[PDB]
Design a binder for this molecule. Structure first.
Ligand SMILES: *[C@@H]1O[C@H](CO)[C@@H](O)[C@H](O)[C@H]1NC(C)=O
Ligand SMILES: *[C@@H]1O[C@H](CO)[C@@H](O)[C@H](O)[C@H]1NC(C)=O
Lengths: 50, 48
């Protein structure tokens, strides 16, 4: 699962059959690291109008 | 694909099903690949 976003430590508690979490637009906003089983929020990189 | 969803609930009702809400988490995804049209559950006898 590829993407680009800021990774932060997450307060969400995934059930053991869950690997990722989807938002309204079905983009992965939370993910479980496959090596150390911890949850990470994926906030997107900042977008601005110049 | 044979999907097992499971949930354990502590109940104390005597006869019928309890009234409430409990979502079943998926337990085992089982790779059988066979035709199933009829099933039968297994009980245990008590001998004395
Ligand atoms: C290897 O990955 C497993 C999860 O599949 C994890 O439990 C274990 O701690 C990992 N070991 C190392 C050395 O990263
Ligand atoms: C599964 O079994 C039923 C009854 O034996 C039969 O009618 C049906 O055609 C079978 N399906 C397949 C895909 O073999």
């Amino acid at each position: 699962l590829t993407g680009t976003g800021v990774l932060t430590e997450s307060n969400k508690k995934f059930l053991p059959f869950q690997q990722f979490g989807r938002d309204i637009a079905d983009t992965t906003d939370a993910v479980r690291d496959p090596q150390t089983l911890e949850i990470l929020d994926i906030t997107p990189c900042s977008f601005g109008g110049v | 694909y044979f999907k097992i969803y499971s949930k354990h609930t502590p109940i104390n009702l005597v006869r019928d099903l309890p009234q409430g809400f409990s979502a079943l988490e998926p337990l085992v995804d089982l790779p059988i690949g066979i035709n199933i049209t009829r099933f039968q559950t297994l009980l245990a006898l008590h001998r004395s």
